[PDB]
Amino acid sequence: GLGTARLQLVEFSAFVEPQRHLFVHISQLESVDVRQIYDKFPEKKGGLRELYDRGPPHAFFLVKFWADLNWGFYGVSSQYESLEHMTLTCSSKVCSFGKQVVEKVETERAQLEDGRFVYRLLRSPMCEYLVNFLHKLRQLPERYMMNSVLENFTILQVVTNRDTQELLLCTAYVFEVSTSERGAQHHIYRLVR
């Protein structure tokens, strides 16, 4: 599972609507050495290397997506849950060739449902930089070219307890493209050193 004692990812998805199309989808464990990816994110140092030093290390995950790009409103939907009532800050950074080019900061209040608290961030509009980027990527004539382009782009999500500023979840994403026959796919990994 992608999660800690305090906070779990229930569902994640990114999509376009005119019946929607999902680029990637997680509905709800191998490891990887964070040193192998230090370079994919800034040495900002709000990038990965510094965050990991201050831990906790069990809070840090890597997701590799093989996206489905064969298909307007662009959106992202996240759902988390916990047994504690919290307020969350969710920070998402896009990084391109080592440099942070987007930062999006959102908060969500716990909601009571079925004996647990859920934190629903639903249909957030995907930022414009990403929509435009996806429209170009969609044009490329060959899957191997898309992957070459995508090798230089990563996303980092940082979820903290807003009232204590404790990190609860830190997730790095990296991306390739799948063929239409093989649909979207993901693999989740703990990060270690």
Ligand SMILES: O=C(O)c1ccccc1Nc1cccc(C(F)(F)F)c1
């Ligand atoms: O959608 C935005 O505006 C977004 C902005 C900054 C950082 C991440 C963002 N969204 C996001 C976050 C995680 C994964 C994906 C996607 F999977 F769509 F690429 C998109």
